[PDB]
Amino acid sequence: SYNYAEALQKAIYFYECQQAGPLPEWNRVEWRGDATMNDEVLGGWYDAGDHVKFNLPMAYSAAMLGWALYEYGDDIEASGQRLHLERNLAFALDYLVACDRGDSVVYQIGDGAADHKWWGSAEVIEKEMTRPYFVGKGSAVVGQMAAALAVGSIVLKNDTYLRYAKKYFELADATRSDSTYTAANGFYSSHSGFWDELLWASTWLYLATGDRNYLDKAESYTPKLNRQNQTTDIEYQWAHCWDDCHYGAMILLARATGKEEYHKFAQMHLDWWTPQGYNGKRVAYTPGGLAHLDTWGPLRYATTEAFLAFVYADSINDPALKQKYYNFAKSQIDYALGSNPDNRSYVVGFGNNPPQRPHHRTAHGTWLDKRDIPEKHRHVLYGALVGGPGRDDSYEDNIEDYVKNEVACDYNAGFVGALCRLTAEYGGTPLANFPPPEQRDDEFFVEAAINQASDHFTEIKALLNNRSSWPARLIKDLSYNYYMDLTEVFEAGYSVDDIKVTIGYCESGMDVEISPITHLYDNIYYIKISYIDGTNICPIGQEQYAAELQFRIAAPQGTKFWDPTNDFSYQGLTRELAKTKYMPVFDGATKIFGEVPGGL
Amino acid sequence: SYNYAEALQKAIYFYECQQAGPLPEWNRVEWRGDATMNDEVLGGWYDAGDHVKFNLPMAYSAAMLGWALYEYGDDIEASGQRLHLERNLAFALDYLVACDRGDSVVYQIGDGAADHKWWGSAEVIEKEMTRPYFVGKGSAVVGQMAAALAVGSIVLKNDTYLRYAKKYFELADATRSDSTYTAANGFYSSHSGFWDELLWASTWLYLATGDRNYLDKAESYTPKLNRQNQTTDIEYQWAHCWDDCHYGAMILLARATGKEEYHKFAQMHLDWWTPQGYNGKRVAYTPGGLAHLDTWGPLRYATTEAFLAFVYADSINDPALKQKYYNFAKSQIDYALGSNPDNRSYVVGFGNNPPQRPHHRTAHGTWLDKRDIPEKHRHVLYGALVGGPGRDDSYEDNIEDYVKNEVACDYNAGFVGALCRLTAEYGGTPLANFPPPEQRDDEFFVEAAINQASDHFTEIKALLNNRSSWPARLIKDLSYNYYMDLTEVFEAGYSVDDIKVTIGYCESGMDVEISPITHLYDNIYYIKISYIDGTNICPIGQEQYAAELQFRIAAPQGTKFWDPTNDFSYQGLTRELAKTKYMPVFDGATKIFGEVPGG
């Protein structure tokens, strides 16, 4: 129905857009560089369109990427995506290992409220704020980190991951408390408690080791799981997600023990998600066919359930159940890819009429802490599954809609597993030249205006801009030149030492020098304006993205010879600020924008 | 009893504080310089604690000083004040002549609203605003200008003043309208109309010339005067003042003609001012004995009536009436000088517990366009009669009380006349070395702070200040130097060129250059910060009184030898802005503040 291989290819690439510094050599994202290099634990993924490392959904996401490989890794070699998926997973797992503090782990990097208040690119955030870290032993977060490492250890044949999976599970299981999990409250609060994470982690450890202690542990946790409302049934009227993986764990335990209790649960849970429902109870459905669990991230939930439904259907023999669960799963993936009332993809950079304004700071590429400027994103966030439409299938592609246009690690995670299943069956060819190079716009440049003209001086207002985005970055040794023709000075009988440079304004905190007037060739002379710490010119807000200087170059008062109209850098200047290519910008001795007199 | 000669001396000196530029060479006020030199008409007096030239009260005030001389000029020799009063009057009269525009006159310099919105010194106001002028031929303003020049022609023996007096009288009398008198609205509106000015001017022209044609014109105007309420009597229940001089004109006509009608008016009017009243009717009196006509300028009114009463009493023979009017007059002057429930002078710089916070911008001497800072006036407005107390004798000396602490030309004018009469009688000695020199503050100076320090640089925040006040003034070629000792640099093996001058903030609008680093002597070096138009540093408001620059003097990055602790201009600097004498200030090549290495 769709090129599922291309969808998969893009859906994986999304995680490379999320990578924190240092980036691996193989990162394919031209607009991402090393970022947050001062973090207490390096690497791993930014969670969403923000720059926080939230370990609970991060580890959940990694676990689900592992699960995708565990089920379908062998079945997808024609898509050419296995190695991409593997190394993207390893990048996250390496971070979870690096978080170890023995009796505790680093479980968060960045303050949610502080991070979210600012809108700008990953690579420049350290100019705006200083990022804290958080340590604890919350059973949910540590149990999820254990689970991710347990499945990772299988699919990546890695004994280190298994060692740390066991370290973390033991800690989580001994602690039996979420009390030290606080830094993520209101962002990724532990809602369901921690028994489901212990179940999920122990189940994966059983599947990793075959050690029956882990199966016995797993089975011991089931009576501690939350009930469905006031009944005695284990809760089933929700989705497998970052907060609660018991749903998927029950499916895995149905396959592993073959016990009827696990099969009964899986069928009750999945039936509730299907159009036919479960004895009169059913998830809300949009008229367009999307199972719509909640206001936030409906596509995330429905596509994750699609993965669970595929795995369960593939693990059973009943033809009617297999067809019912398969059709449900494929229907939800196809809705996300364009089988909906608007015939449109909900995956950035894929299919027909994809979203172009995901709520994602670094893909946007602002310079001044605004969402509305630039009005179009500078970068393509390929593969990102957005939050999706409302309950009535309504949707508009708007950067301001932080619900419908949300993007996140956990949104993509189960989705990857479901695309693995579909490309395994249907094939499809990935895009050969992927990703294609972006059209860039100008990054470092001067905007200038005639601030005042006089019969004996020129006064310039000049703004040296850093609107970098490919990737956003900092240049320390920034300078620009203002070129003049002094022919008329010499012809009137004056000399270079008769011309005075003065300053009428220089912006606070921008350490700057202006050179003496310097000979280029013939009668062509220039001044260079140098910012000693040019990194302070950075795309982090209204004040910082450019440095303003007003300089005056003046012949003696009363003289009548000064002629700016033959000066190279005066060309095209008006009384309103405008970008000019005739005041070239330099990084050290290397010209990075503009033109010089006489060219190359 | 008071030293009325000293009070007179100071009350005259007040007018020197009021002079607009160019100042005469004899001006005695150390804190006044040439001000408002771009005005359409130069000289004359600022009206009050503001900088508007309002011709109606200015001319009234000059007419009153002329009248003082006319009556008492020969009688005030012991006081030594005749010459002072004379030349102060001529200064204003010269302004009145210079307003002539043929078919009209300049009658105002300044926009009252814009002038009053700003708080600062006369000498710097042109940096804040452009001052418009206004031309017209209002009968009241022109007629008062005529009167002032007519009495001035007599007492200063000046034919030119007489010619202009006649020309202005004729213009006012031809026009018979205040319709062209507009720019003073709400400040000095013509309330009484103009007939009283024509009466006052024609009376003075009669006294100047002896030409009975002017007497005939004067008498022709009295039926046109306003009535008292709905009655047939000429209005009498108010004071002679800048708006209405018919009161004094009638007293002059009583003496000149001897006619009963003028004497009846004069006694009706003065009786109403006295504690005994006019047929049961009387001006309000405070319990402390001040005749209190109105909320605004009660001392101005009472002291002006004192002068009228003295002149009328001196002109009659009846000893009972003479005593009654003389006692009234002296009681009011004495109230003003300290004979009141608080035993306090209402004349700045005189007597016991005088006002110290008159509502006067130039005597205050701020640099910030604020009334509250400085908290004490930097100058002494000697001789200014304030507005004064309320109806209950209540008063507080507060700069914000623009009623009770108002000061003005017209407030002093009748007062001088009355003081002439009292010093004529009592013959006191003026102060010998008047005025004494004031304590001054530093006017042009740097305030500096260490903005940032590191192992390889010094960064200074420097504010170059103009808080001038003796007098407030402007200096274009301003600079200051910053001196350093580089011994630590050569001793570690580095040179001068290992040192870079940069800027981290340059206040908008302050065109500046910093020289290259310069050797003084030995291992002592400096930089010079120069403002190209230093006049933009001026005591006109929060932004303008100082120019801020942040400059950094830097060795190469990473090194650790830099040692600011032996730099001359670094001495005493903290991380808080403070005045420093070690960053000296220059006007051109001349040091005006601070110290240099080696002296």
Ligand SMILES: [Ca+2]
């Ligand atoms: Ca949980």
Ligand SMILES: [Ca+2]
């Ligand atoms: Ca030229």
Ligand SMILES: [Ca+2]
């Ligand atoms: Ca009048």
Ligand SMILES: [Ca+2]
């Ligand atoms: Ca030193």
Ligand SMILES: [Cl-]
């Ligand atoms: Cl169904």
Ligand SMILES: [Cl-]
């Ligand atoms: Cl835009």
Ligand SMILES: [Cl-]
């Ligand atoms: Cl020339």
Ligand SMILES: [Cl-]
């Ligand atoms: Cl070029």
Ligand SMILES: [Cl-]
């Ligand atoms: Cl006119």
Ligand SMILES: [Cl-]
């Ligand atoms: Cl009486």
Ligand SMILES: [Cl-]
């Ligand atoms: Cl103060």
Ligand SMILES: [Cl-]
């Ligand atoms: Cl010295």
